[PDB]
Design a binder for these strands. Structure first.
Lengths: 63, 58, 143, 181
RNA sequence: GUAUCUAGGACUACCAUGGUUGCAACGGGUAACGGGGAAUCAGGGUUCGAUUCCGGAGAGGGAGCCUGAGAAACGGCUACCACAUCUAAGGAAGGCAGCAGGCGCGUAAAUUACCCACUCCCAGCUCGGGGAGGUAGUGACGAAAAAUAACAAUACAGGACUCAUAUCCGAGGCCCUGUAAUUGGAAUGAGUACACUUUAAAUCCUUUAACAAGGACCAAUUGGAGGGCAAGUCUGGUGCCAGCAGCCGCGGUAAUUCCAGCUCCAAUAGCGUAUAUUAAAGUUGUUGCGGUUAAAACGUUCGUAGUUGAACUUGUGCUUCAUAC
């Protein structure tokens, strides 16, 4: 111990921090945790998308 | 000739079959290196042995 | 007395090497392309074979010894293979017609001991590690 | 990939296994430097071979060209840095007679032993695993830190070590809760 | 002249009668994608290099072709052919050598994971998306690092030590040295688990509160031990039997090689098997051998292709200085 080098990203202000904000890195102290996909069903969902025209409302029962 | 192959392992059929079951499980290798001087230094003074062997029982 | 020390001669001087590569009778072991021919299991390391029968071989003279040998068939090329078992006993560890792995015999392909015509040695039987069965490390499956 | 891992493989074999004349000589190295096994005896012999033949490839060249100085002195820069090479052996013909034991004298296992912290060659080499050794900011679990000559003035015990008095048992501090309690 | 984006026997027609070769051409053969490159020593190397890099190629067998700048594309289509799909029997669909799976196969090889934070890319695009790419579970293929205790008197034997006495001899002995399931002092961190950290999130590594050894535990072997080749002419058993064993050879009744135990050794988290390969091997050689006979000059002489070739074909000086002295 006694030696822990890290980093600090000192923005000027909060709204300018809201301009860059790497969200998956910001999520350690994230005030914004939304949109869990979770990256497996979505390509299956998009696979269901390519056989439906116009409406895209047959995707309810499959989740 | 393939007459009889019966006695294969005959000395495995005439064993006394004594075991070990004892004798003080050893130490690690660096500690195994440590003992290799107390039998090698002063015991072992290397006098006039007149064609003697080191690891002889008798 | 011979050897061609001319400077501009090299076009002779590697033709005259290769014209004498197969004199050195231990250098046709792969060069003629016969490893697929007659190393009696096909040029690999070992052989997942099947046991055929226990044969009654005899040792070379002046040594009247009976090495209690086995017969093997292979699923790779399908020929007749004569192998050899160590460590007296183990004929009761054979349990004939078993899927057997068989390695060589440690001379790069010749009759080694007093044992003629057997160019192999067993190391495995029945996928259950033949070596540790005399010391009883592994339990032998019977059926 | 890419570049998986370069070989650089140590554990160099002996070309003859059972020579008695090397059999007695290796154990004298363990008779002073009580190493873990014979592979580490190779490991410093692995090191000097990089010093031997490479410097020997300089000797077949003549003075004065660049590489006999450039790769020449930078060897000697590092060779006097590690502390086996003194000032009187400055030239490259003075370095090939360097024996194997000078690198062994610089070893962290015995540099704490020739210093007054260890008082035994086997009380020395056991303390590095339990990390009661500090060099100026850092504790080292590795016994093969083998020290450069400037790093002699700074080698000592740790602050989190029981010497000098940080969690002095600490298993022994629970031991007073057992026998007195 | 045609086509072709363009050279052009690319190809039609007319014309000439040629390109090629013992300086191994054309022919077949390869368990042959080239290459950057990989492994071993004194060089010269001989082996290979499927496989992250680069380049050329294929998406079952083959072949045409749309669209576009750009495929002869196959996670586009078409045929046939192979092997398999569904069907109400009228029809429709098919390539995992993309990923993870099974099946078969053979000695022979991983989760039906997570994530776009990294690196790049895609477009209308800061924003979308990418089993690219990252991470984890798998892995003794590997490479690197390094835990099996450390310290104490007595002890029990050897020695120095002081000294009696010396072909003898002991005591003051004893820094030492061993054996001590004698006695310890117990030094401790793997395990262990708060919290922490790192992360997309999580684990793991580092940090770490609480945990943590009188061993029986927190427990290393694998192979040997006649000679090569390192180290019991120990014991029991066995009697040319069973075996052993790379080779040399040991077993034929008092076994240094077998089967056990015994101790000893080896390297050590690695040992072993077999299998190809280089070194050893100056036993594939120009360096680097051999030809009297140990394996070995065509019986012969000319003789081209080969390959190697004499000599002779502008200089020492002369004077001076930088310059050693």
């Amino acid at each position: 111990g006694g030696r822990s080098t890290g980093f600090a990203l000192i923005y000027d202000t909060l709204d300018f921090a809201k301009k860059f904000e790497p969200k998956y890195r910001l999520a350690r102290h994230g005030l914004f945790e939304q949109k869990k996909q979770t990256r497996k069903q979505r390509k299956e969902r998009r696979n269901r998308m390519k056989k439906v025209r116009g409406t895209a409302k047959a995707k309810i029962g499959t989740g | 000739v393939h007459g009889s192959l019966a006695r294969a392992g005959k000395v495995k059929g005439q064993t006394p079959k004594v075991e070990k079951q004892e004798k003080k499980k050893k130490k690690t290798g660096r500690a195994k290196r440590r003992i290799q001087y107390n039998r090698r230094f002063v015991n072992f003074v290397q006098g006039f042995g007149r064609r003697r062997g080191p690891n002889a029982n008798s | 007395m011979g050897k061609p020390r001319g400077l501009r001669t090299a076009r002779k001087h590697v033709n005259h090497r290769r014209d004498q590569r197969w004199a050195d009778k231990d250098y046709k072991k792969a060069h003629l392309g016969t490893r697929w021919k007659a190393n009696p299991f096909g040029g690999a390391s070992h052989a997942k074979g099947i046991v055929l029968e226990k044969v009654g071989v005899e040792a070379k003279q002046p040594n009247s010894a009976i090495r209690k040998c086995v017969r093997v068939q292979l699923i790779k090329n399908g020929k007749k293979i004569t192998a050899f078992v160590p460590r007296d006993g183990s004929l009761n560890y054979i349990e004939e017609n078993d899927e057997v792995l068989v390695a060589g015999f440690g001379r790069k392909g010749h009759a080694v001991g007093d044992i003629p015509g057997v160019r192999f040695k067993v190391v495995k039987v029945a996928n259950v590690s033949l070596l540790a069965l005399y010391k009883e490390k592994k339990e032998r499956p019977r059926s | 990939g890419r570049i998986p891992s370069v070989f650089s493989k140590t554990y160099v074999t002996p070309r003859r296994p059972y020579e008695k004349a090397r059999l007695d000589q290796e154990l004298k190295i363990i008779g002073e430097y009580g190493l873990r096994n014979k592979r580490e005896v190779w490991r410093v012999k692995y090191a000097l071979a990089k010093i031997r033949k490479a410097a020997r490839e300089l000797l077949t060249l003549d003075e004065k060209d660049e590489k006999r100085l450039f790769q020449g002195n930078a060897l000697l820069r590092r060779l006097v840095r590690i502390g086996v090479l003194d000032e009187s052996r400055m030239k490259l013909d003075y370095v090939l007679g360097l024996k194997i034991e000078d690198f062994l004298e610089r070893r962290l296992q015995t540099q704490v032993f020739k210093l007054g912290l260890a008082k035994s060659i086997h009380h020395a080499r056991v303390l590095i695993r339990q990390r009661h050794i500090r060099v100026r900011k850092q504790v080292v679990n590795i016994p093969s830190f083998v020290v450069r000559l400037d790093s002699q003035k700074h080698i000592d015990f740790s602050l989190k070590s029981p010497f000098g008095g940080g969690r002095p048992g600490r298993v022994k501090r629970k031991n007073l809760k057992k026998n007195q309690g």
